[PDB]
């Protein structure tokens, strides 16, 4: 079996905002690394572009 000696190997905490997480870690005395939230960028979609008269976007199949 898989053995461990780490008592915190399973602990996961959930926070509303990064500030709450940072405050919790600071008051508990843990060194922390924060990563900014990554969101998908807004993309311009257009169905008609699939059938461009002169553009490269035209689909070869559908």
């Amino acid at each position: 079996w898989s053995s461990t000696a780490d008592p915190l190997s399973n602990l996961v905490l959930t926070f509303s905002t990064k500030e709450d997480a940072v405050a919790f870690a600071e008051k508990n005395g843990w060194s922390f690394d924060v990563e900014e939230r990554k969101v998908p960028k807004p993309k311009s979609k257009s169905y008609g572009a699939n059938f461009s008269w002169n553009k490269r976007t035209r689909v070869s199949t559908k």
Binding site: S52, W53, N54, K55, R56, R58, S60
Partner: protein, 43 residues
């Protein structure tokens, strides 16, 4: 005047390449095709 005869017998003498032969014949009167500016959508 007569309406007792179905004249339409041209098709009986139509062969396998008749449509394409007519297309080749008609290729002469055609106006120049337009162009998108590419050789292909993948060019």
């Amino acid at each position: 005047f007569d309406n007792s005869t179905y004249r339409n017998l041209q098709h009986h003498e139509y062969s396998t390449y008749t449509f394409l032969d007519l297309n080749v014949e008609l290729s002469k009167f055609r106006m120049p095709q337009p162009s998108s500016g590419r050789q292909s959508p993948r060019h």
